[PDB]
Design a protein around this nucleic acid. Sequence first.
DNA 1: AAGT
RNA 2: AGGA
DNA 3: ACTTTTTCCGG
Lengths: 97, 107, 84, 171, 112, 557, 178, 268
Amino acid sequence: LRFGEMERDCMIAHGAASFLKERLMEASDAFRVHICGICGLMTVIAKLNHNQFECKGCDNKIDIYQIHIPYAAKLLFQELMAMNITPRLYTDRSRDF
Amino acid sequence: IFVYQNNITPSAMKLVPSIPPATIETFNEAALVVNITHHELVPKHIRLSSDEKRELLKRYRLKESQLPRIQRADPVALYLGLKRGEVVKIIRKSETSGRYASYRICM
Amino acid sequence: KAIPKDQRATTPYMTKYERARILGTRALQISMNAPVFVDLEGETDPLRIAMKELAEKKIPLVIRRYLPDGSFEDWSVEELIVDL
Amino acid sequence: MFFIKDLSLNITLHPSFFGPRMKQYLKTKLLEEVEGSCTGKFGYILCVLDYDNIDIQRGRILPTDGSAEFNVKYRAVVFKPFKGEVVDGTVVSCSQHGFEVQVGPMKVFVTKHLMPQDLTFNAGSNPPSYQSSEDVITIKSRIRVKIEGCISQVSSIHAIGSIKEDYLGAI
Amino acid sequence: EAGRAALYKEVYNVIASDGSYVNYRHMALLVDVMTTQGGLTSVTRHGFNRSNTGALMRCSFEETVEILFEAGASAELDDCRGVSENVILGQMAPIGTGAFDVMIDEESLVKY
Amino acid sequence: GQQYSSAPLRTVKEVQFGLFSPEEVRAISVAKIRFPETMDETQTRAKIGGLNDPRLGSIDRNLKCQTCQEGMNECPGHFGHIDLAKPVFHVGFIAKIKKVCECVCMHCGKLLLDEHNELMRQALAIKDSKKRFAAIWTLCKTKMVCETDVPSEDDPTQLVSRGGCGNTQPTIRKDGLKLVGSWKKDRATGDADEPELRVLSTEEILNIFKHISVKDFTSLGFNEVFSRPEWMILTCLPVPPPPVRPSISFNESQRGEDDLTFKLADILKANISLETLEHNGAPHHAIEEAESLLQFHVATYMDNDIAGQPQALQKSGRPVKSIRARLKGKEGRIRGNLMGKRVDFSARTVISGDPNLELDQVGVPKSIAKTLTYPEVVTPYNIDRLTQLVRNGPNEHPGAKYVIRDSGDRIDLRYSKRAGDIQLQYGWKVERHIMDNDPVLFNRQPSLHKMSMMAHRVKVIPYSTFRLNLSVTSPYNADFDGDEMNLHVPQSEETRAELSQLCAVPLQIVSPQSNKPCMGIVQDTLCGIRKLTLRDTFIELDQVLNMLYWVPDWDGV
Amino acid sequence: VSTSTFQTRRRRLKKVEEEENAATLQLGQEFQLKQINHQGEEEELIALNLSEARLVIKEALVERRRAFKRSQKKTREKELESIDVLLEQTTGGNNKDLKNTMQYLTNFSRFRDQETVGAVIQLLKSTGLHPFEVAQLGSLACDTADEAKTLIPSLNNKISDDELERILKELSNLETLY
Amino acid sequence: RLVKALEDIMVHYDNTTRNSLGNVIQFIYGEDGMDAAHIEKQSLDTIGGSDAAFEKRYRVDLLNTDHTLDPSLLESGSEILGDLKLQVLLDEEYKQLVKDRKFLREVFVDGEANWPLPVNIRRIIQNAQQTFHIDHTKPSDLTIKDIVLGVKDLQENLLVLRGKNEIIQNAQRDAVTLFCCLLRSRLATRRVLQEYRLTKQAFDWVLSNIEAQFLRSVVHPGEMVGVLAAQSIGEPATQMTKKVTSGVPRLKEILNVAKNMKTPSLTV
DNA sequence: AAGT
RNA sequence: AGGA
DNA sequence: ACTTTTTCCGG
Ligand SMILES: [Mg+2]
Ligand SMILES: [Zn+2]
Ligand SMILES: [Zn+2]
Ligand SMILES: [Zn+2]
């Protein structure tokens, strides 16, 4: 069924942060990716079996994180990259405030 | 403050900033005929000191950005001769609380 | 940066959201076979257990209340007043 | 060499462990991973110092899974070898290609070519030996090697070394 | 400041015209938002949506691709403080339940 | 179901936007991407080492990915690349390219105005990157000459050399995908009368963009690390993996490749003609012809809906779907796949009013309760009940559909040869049916209210309609004239607390929208309540006694 | 999950140079002279001369046996047997590295007593050399200043030959006669 | 648009109303820091009436044989007559009541007394009456200090903002101004004694209840106020069906900040 | 039906 | 093409 | 001269 923009709004209205998260992840889309800690892209050639990680390009076999985002977001990010835009995702912050 | 009737020529206006730290204000006489500050809709604006603004920012844990703004060209910002960076404390009446105090930094 | 207990300025009372997230969190843990901090006087629902744990302010959780600047006030479910 | 490095491991505990023996279970789970561990970044983590004063900190409860994540701030004895580092070690293995040397937790192998020319491989000995005009390098023999280069291999660091230069070799 | 009071009066009147009543605070907030900028900021594609909030938050309304194209060309950095950015990332938004954090204290545990 | 990964799990704190450097595309790339042919190694059903899986993602479903050994649901896509024969503008940047040419010298690559001009040093002060560019452009756009020497920051008699080159700046105007300039000239002080009209090459704009100083481009919108201006001109095109452009492979022997796959093929096709054309005996006009066509495809692939009207169309008349078009609002990635989503554990049916239901309860038809499933963890408190439901099977009401072990494997109670003999273990989840008094989120679309989505207690009932108390009619705005409603079921003991403790119907009674109760006594009950309370209205013992018993919380007095 | 440290360098996209490590006393990014302890204070690098390192682990593991037996309430060849017993007690046994290390140290140590290791640490930490040179001087037994300066080629001009040779003499006296 | 415009706005842990940039929209939610659910339309009695009737109501003159409180009102009645020290308190009291009357007459220009405010005092007092079985025949055990100081003390505890600094403390006094206005009017010495007839216990109970009910009424740091407001305007808009442009299209004109308006007018 |  |  | 939104859900 549909859990659209309007229903998102009401959920934000109630303050049901986890309910919404769950509605958009567990209840639907939810996917797991491996991202490079240097260039926040889905570049990582995770052979999660032999415990081998890597990101040729960065020569990074160490600084690699696991993340849970909706599959459509993995998609969006790949589509943005498809059009030369880099939506670099980082697990830490620099800006503060 | 220069109070002119119809205009101040573009030649003359080019000399307004030329004398620092002193400051000059142009004011069309015809505007001043009525005081805007006396109007129903216009609340009390109060210019803050460098120490008062330093405190407002400390007390509400704000960066200058994070404040509601008042335009340098604002009728009240002109009336009070607000320079960019100066903050006004706006004491308005509230149908809710009786008295609510807003703040506006000058852009 | 972390605000010291003596310098805290938030509600001494617990938010509607704090209470709802504590009961959810304890219910999830009690249901995940966590150690229960009170006599379950016939109790079998992890929410009802969590509600009882909270009733006797026997929940070992701590609310980290964040401020717009990043600074925060740590408040215990023990110290938070549940008027609500 | 051999360092005392201040490190920190993020451990993620299941709710069933939220009993008094929690700081206890965490400390043990740390040693489980960290102790004996090997990185290229810090080398062989060998022994965790000051068990009693390990800093557990507050564990943050993770959104939809009841588990709590703690950053465990701790201090340990590490061993990270470098090129140019001169190490004393006992021989382990020996072949026509050269010999391996046990230096603490790591094995450093010396090529026949990274050895003086005079010392030659004597296949006909129990166990295999390297024989100089004066010296004899065999399985149990003690050596002093200059580490020429390092390779970070998964759960270890292996190195290549020379006993060619002055003040190196049989001790 | 007068613009604010006018804009509210004007809004309130649209509501009370139909007969209906909305509590002050609600219209107050809308008015205050359009206003804090320093002037009248339209509740439109080129109004509020052209402010300094995170690229993804802004792209969730009206100019999407064009928004994201600029985001990349100027190397924008999304703070991820906004709701929209956490919905897009499948994260718990810093809203109600998520406006604070929950931790266990080992001390208050070994106590009970 | 996704597998365990030893990789530290974190949340995304920041999204740092930027542009791909052609160097990065060639680095992150798992394959290059030379043959327009999809697969069929000369009709042989399997992927060619040319397009899709020359080490990319993976079609076939069975047969896992060559690179990340994982295969399908686990394997994200793997990006490739196409080294383009000549550079081409990225559609989206066509005017931020043009506007950058307008600010910089078209020969030396220096800002047409500097710290020497005062209006310029005023615009250079601006903190907002977007606004600072806005002001710098409106300033340098008029500057039609690169200045050799400019008056000193004091007197007009002594002039300071700001930087070399004097060359006249072209009057840049766009001609749908191409940038054509018109240099002012001189010839006996006048000319124009009739200037120099020549189209600016992609490669020349690039070489100038390369020469724009870090300080210079940095003064404009740009950033030296993530978005240098030279990167708006495409050199090395990234090849998106199959997960992005799926092969809708209906039956065995029949392709069904995506539009993006066809469009990328057209790019390759055009890129090869251009490459050979120039390497071979270059008939020049033929090159600027094959170049312009490559520019077209690379453009139309990202955005097909361009002002300069040729709308690239699939031979079917139907136009090719842009990457832009895919992301474009309401129904389309951001709005339709991310802000909104089709979800599981959701049910919908016709709604009907019930005066015997409680305010906060919702009548759930058996069929729906029997389908909707909550995952309960086997705990010492539940174990006994749970096994009885497991035993009860997916067919009878208080029953269960699946069992989930520590091993993470799903046990379908509908088919399992061990559906009878099933001994549960603590920590196992039992996917049990939606039972009475469970919290469920009940909504009636549109949903312009926080009160259009409220939490209720399930009441399993016969007959196919969602039954609901009549007083809750108003907040939802529902009538029973064929109106339908949605029901979402929380899966956590946590998401449940959120429903029960924040959005339950009784909490939602007195509304903040107008500081008054948003639910009252409607219709029949309202009408009867008047009739009942008139002074004229008296009731005999018989009935009084029934009316008293009818009140469930009666004192018995 | 793996281990992190006090060095929080934000390498934003700009990956490399991961410059070589040597006896140019140019060790890792991590193994730098200026470091930060738990507390946040700038502390100097702690390098240990194997014996300084033997006594550290010895202490650590011994005090660990204490804590384990507390919670459970409710001569070189002979030092090796003593050690190989404490490891079975305290460690997970799986640490084949520590068992190998403990034996290596127990054998290769120049200074047996804590009293002795103190005096070595005094004598050396007065020369102002990098903790690495100080460890290598206390670890490798040398006679000629030529020997030490050749084996620790970081020393080169950091000390007088006669001075290093005075230090080498006192190090030889401290050397516990096994 | 109303939603997408306001989404990111919520109340933070400093009662401040902020967006995703942490920029302040309102310094305190809805200018008072109260949850809209907890607010009810109450009458500010001090606002209107004859200046004469105001005096009849709130004035107590212990120095006058006719305007003192009769010993039928309280047990102190006899010993209270002529007490100069107490008359300083009743003057202080009456002087504030008059200050408030003139203040309210500034805020509410037309003299509208019906304003939505937290804590329904009418009911607190009504409930004290049945709870304590209030005898409208016998005199109260209240002191003038008990009543006057009692109200003063309650006021110190009607907390909205908590910080220990002048900026915050002044902001606090401000946000609470109007409620106190009503409270002082409903809890004036004569009003309490003559009208309500409350006893010490009943009074003490009425007080603690106001306090608690007030505290209860404050907004919850996390309240998604942005989306709430967006919807609380958005939904009523959906039910929409001199001659100036009104309803939906005038509202359309508004949000757009359209210069070319359909019905421009001046009211001179 | 509006607005760069 | 059709429901609210 | 030139662009973009418009309530929610069987083929
Ligand atoms: Mg209907
Ligand atoms: Zn990378
Ligand atoms: Zn793969
Ligand atoms: Zn030039």
